[PDB]
Amino acid sequence: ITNLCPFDEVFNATRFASVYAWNRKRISNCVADYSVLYNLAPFFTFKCYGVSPTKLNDLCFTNVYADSFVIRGDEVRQIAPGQTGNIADYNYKLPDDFTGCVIAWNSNKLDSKVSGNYNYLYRLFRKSNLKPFERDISTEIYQAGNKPCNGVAGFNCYFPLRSYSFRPTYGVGHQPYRVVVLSFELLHAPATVCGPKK
């Protein structure tokens, strides 16, 4: 195997998913150079879980997944095992035993608009928390009271998604952040993704 894992395709993608509809890329059968992580001047978020970021070029995995989405700055803390909040509960849930790294960076220059960007949505209402790595893209009306909604938004009957409405003058906690979650999976299977020269 001489092909490099396409980490650049994910971090430098022009468009990112809404968090409720988070995107997943399967990276396999490649050599991974984590140099894109190491050569960041750390106004970037960089927290890894289970393995250390130095020991990554000495590792092999059966599959790497790259999940990506946009959230608010105040919500980046929710992209971690054991967290709570609208995002962790209803949009993107990492498992307690997560092994991987979470990478995030401010994208105010790309994802805000003076007129407000309403393209990025998150799920605000759902009757149960997500399981880890669950993705709910339903837009059925949320029944917040005892009476049935019959598919009509109204009293106690709320459309479950809402827009972040990013504007460039927002405070940092409300500015958009792009997030990439790299998950490192290893099963009883031959390794497909390895560091340089393993």
Epitope: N3, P6, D8, E9, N12, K25
Partner: antibody, heavy 127, light 108 residues
Framework: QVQLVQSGAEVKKPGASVKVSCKAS????????ISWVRQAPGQGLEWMGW????????NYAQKFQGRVTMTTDTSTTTGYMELRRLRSDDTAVYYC????????????????????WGQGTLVTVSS | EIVLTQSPGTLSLSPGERATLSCRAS???????LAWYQQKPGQAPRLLIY???SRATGIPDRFSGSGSGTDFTLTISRLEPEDFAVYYC????????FGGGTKVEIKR
């Protein structure tokens, strides 16, 4: 230290076909797609298409969908552009460039441009 | 189809003066997908700005990219003799298209 070297000049008559090669060197070849751009003498730039060096997926401009065919060889790290049914309008310098506007693996748009450009190949079409 | 219109076609300026080139689009273009290129006579185009604002590798700091929506600008803070060339904006928000180019001419 990256260099993209293109084939020499070609002179063709209308209705013939031309194939231009582009030998890339000095970077991970399969991680970057190749984009082809031509420039008629005195005119602006005209994008022709994109090919993934990873899986061979191709994107072409509508102006050329039926006439252009792009190919890559991973062994020699070389891209190819074939343009059939040539016309006098096709008399232009043809450039290959390293593409960071679409992903070689997943095919989605990337934040970037044509960072490295070949020296260009002059193709003249006349009767 | 997104058509990029660069005005004026020829911009006459003295060396060391400040140059601001306009690129106007027929539709709103994501800043992530606008780029700028320089081409000197007889040479190949080279990438100056990508992502509307990011300077490419090895590009002097005097080159700057700005703008959003339909209106984008490339700024050269102080024109050097090497900066007098033709400049093309490029978008890949929808398909991929180039502008017509603006020639930066030495005013005399």
């Amino acid at each position: 230290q990256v260099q993209l070297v293109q084939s020499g000049a070609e002179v063709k008559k209308p209705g013939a076909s031309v194939k231009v090669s582009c030998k890339a060197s000095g970077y991970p070849f399969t991680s970057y797609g190749i984009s082809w751009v031509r420039q008629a003498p005195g005119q602006g730039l005209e994008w022709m298409g994109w090919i993934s060096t990873y899986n061979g997926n191709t994107n072409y401009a509508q102006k050329f969908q039926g006439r252009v065919t792009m190919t890559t060889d991973t062994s020699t790290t070389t891209g190819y552009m074939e343009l059939r049914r040539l016309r006098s309008d096709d008399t232009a310098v043809y450039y290959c460039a390293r593409d960071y506007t679409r992903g070689a693996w997943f095919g989605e748009s990337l934040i970037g441009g044509f960072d490295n450009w070949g020296q260009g190949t002059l193709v003249t079409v006349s009767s | 189809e997104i058509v990029l219109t660069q005005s004026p076609g020829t911009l006459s300026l003295s060396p060391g003066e400040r140059a601001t080139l306009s690129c106007r689009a027929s539709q709103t273009v994501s800043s992530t997908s606008l780029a700028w290129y320089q081409q000197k006579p007889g040479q190949a185009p080279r990438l100056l700005i990508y992502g509307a604002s990011s300077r490419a590798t090895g590009i002097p700091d005097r080159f700057s990219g700005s703008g959003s929506g339909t209106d984008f600008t490339l700024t050269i803070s102080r024109l050097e003799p090497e900066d007098f060339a033709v400049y093309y904006c490029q978008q890949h928000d929808t398909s991929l298209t180039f502008g017509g180019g603006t020639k930066v001419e030495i005013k005399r």
